[PDB]
């Protein structure tokens, strides 16, 4: 036969790709759709979605790597999958994660992705240079060097770049401290992760279900919890704070 569905839209975004398809033959009666992808460098397609929706959000894909997508459909009362759409190639976009420049208390590396708490006074949180955390991304930090821990230490993500506070342990923010404590809108939760040392990584994965599901992983343990935001979620900031010198954090 001939293909009853084609890919209509590909939305390339920093944290993934949205694929949308449309029926190009009104006379076909669709029950289910089947979406596959592969890296353009790879031989083999894999199913990512089988269901009756006409769009699917593809997450957790290597950024600025080309992927190829194809879709087909089942229906008309039969069980054979239709022929495939023409394939379409897409990639996630590139929005680099970088620290703010010129914030007193922190010195950055050349590519502005490594931040060191120096010997100067600091007024609070070192934020990302802009809100470049997009839900769907895995945001990874690595501790390069350590200093003395302090309860105001934090690494996290938040809705706004707010001045004044000493840490991200505050409303409309999620973060971990250097003792492994996890804070949601400024309230610590019971489950802890292992305290960070040099070489430790911390990852944040955030998915929407105003209410987000957050996974934080560090030192091969993870916590998963709900994060309630008081307004609609857009791109987020990330940030860190360290009271004492010597803490050095790389963001990927």
């Amino acid at each position: 036969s001939r293909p009853p569905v084609q890919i209509e839209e590909l939305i390339e975004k920093p944290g993934g790709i949205i694929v949308r398809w449309c029926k190009v033959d009104d006379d076909f009666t669709a029950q289910d759709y089947r979406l596959q992808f592969r890296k353009c460098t790879a031989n083999h397609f894999e199913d990512v979605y089988v269901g009756s929706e006409t769009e699917f959000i593809v997450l957790h894909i290597d950024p600025n790597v080309d992927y190829q997508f194809r879709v087909c459909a089942r229906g008309d009362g039969r069980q054979e999958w239709s022929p495939w759409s023409v394939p379409q190639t897409g990639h996630s976009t590139l929005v680099p994660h970088e620290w703010t420049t010129g914030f007193e208390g922190y010195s950055l590396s050349s590519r502005r992705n490594i931040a060191l708490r120096n010997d100067a006074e600091s007024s609070g949180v070192l934020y990302s240079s802009a809100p470049t955390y997009f839900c769907g991304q895995t945001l990874t930090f690595r501790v390069e060097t350590v200093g003395q821990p302090d309860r105001r230490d934090s690494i996290g993500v938040c809705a706004e770049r707010q001045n004044g506070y000493e840490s991200l342990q505050r409303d409309q923010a999620v973060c971990i401290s250097t003792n492994g404590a996890v804070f949601v809108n400024g309230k610590e939760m019971t489950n802890q992760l292992p305290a960070v040392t040099s070489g430790s990584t911390v990852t944040f994965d955030i998915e929407a279900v105003a209410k987000l599901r957050v996974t934080i992983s560090s030192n091969n343990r993870e916590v998963v919890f709900d994060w309630l935001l008081e307004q609609a979620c857009g791109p987020l900031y990330f940030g860190c704070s360290f009271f004492y010198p010597g803490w050095k954090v790389l963001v990927f």
Side-chain angles (χ1 to χ4, degrees):
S1 37
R2 280 78 157 91
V5 292
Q6 298 291 344
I7 295 176
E8 176 190 338
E9 307 191 349
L10 286 191
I11 322 185
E12 303 180 345
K13 275 181 183 185
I17 293 168
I18 307 194
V19 186
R20 297 180 177 160
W21 48 96
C22 65
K23 213 153 68 52
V24 303
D25 185 7
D26 282 350
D27 282 326
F28 184 85
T29 314
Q31 63 134 310
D32 294 325
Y33 304 99
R34 180 185 191 192
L35 176 69
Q36 296 187 332
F37 83 137
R38 59 174 193 89
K39 288 193 188 122
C40 282
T41 57
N43 306 299
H44 177 59
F45 284 93
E46 281 274 279
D47 289 339
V48 297
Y49 176 74
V50 188
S52 58
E53 306 226 74
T54 59
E55 74 164 36
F56 182 72
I57 297 154
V58 178
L59 302 173
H60 315 128
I61 49 172
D62 305 352
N64 298 113
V65 178
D66 274 353
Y67 289 71
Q68 190 181 59
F69 300 86
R70 65 184 185 179
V71 67
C72 69
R74 189 156 64 180
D76 277 1
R78 293 170 50 168
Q79 220 60 23
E80 210 85 59
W81 291 106
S82 73
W84 294 106
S85 68
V86 312
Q88 293 275 285
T89 286
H91 63 109
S92 81
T93 50
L94 194 63
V95 182
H97 292 139
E98 289 180 1
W99 301 106
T100 290
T101 59
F103 186 69
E104 189 178 338
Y106 295 84
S107 315
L108 311 190
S109 63
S110 36
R111 294 178 56 215
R112 298 165 307 265
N113 60 347
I114 303 175
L116 167 70
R117 182 78 174 87
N118 61 35
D119 298 294
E121 313 231 39
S122 94
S123 46
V125 162
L126 176 70
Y127 292 99
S128 50
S129 67
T132 60
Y133 177 74
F134 298 89
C135 292
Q137 294 177 328
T138 296
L139 178 63
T140 303
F141 296 101
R142 185 174 78 206
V143 181
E144 303 295 86
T145 60
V146 306
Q148 182 178 354
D150 178 81
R151 71 185 281 96
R152 289 156 288 195
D153 298 341
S154 78
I155 300 171
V157 307
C158 53
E160 302 185 72
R161 182 203 281 267
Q162 301 202 308
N163 198 356
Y165 302 91
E166 283 162 319
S167 79
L168 288 180
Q169 304 165 33
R170 55 145 173 101
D171 196 21
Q172 300 312 291
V174 164
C175 70
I176 191 176
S177 194
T178 43
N179 63 348
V182 176
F183 292 73
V184 183
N185 292 326
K187 309 304 162 190
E188 190 181 348
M189 64 181 30
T190 293
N191 288 335
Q192 297 189 3
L193 297 170
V196 292
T197 56
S198 296
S200 296
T201 62
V202 188
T203 69
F204 294 79
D205 285 283
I206 313 174
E207 303 214 8
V209 201
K211 185 197 229 176
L212 308 178
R213 160 91 31 196
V214 180
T215 307
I216 304 183
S217 316
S218 186
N219 292 315
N220 222 313
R221 311 265 161 139
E222 75 170 33
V223 291
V224 186
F225 55 88
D226 286 335
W227 181 23
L228 305 160
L229 282 182
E230 72 195 359
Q231 292 278 62
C233 172
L236 302 168
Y237 289 91
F238 62 83
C240 72
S241 55
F242 300 98
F243 188 80
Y244 293 109
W247 289 96
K248 187 154 81 177
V249 181
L250 155 79
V251 64
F252 285 91

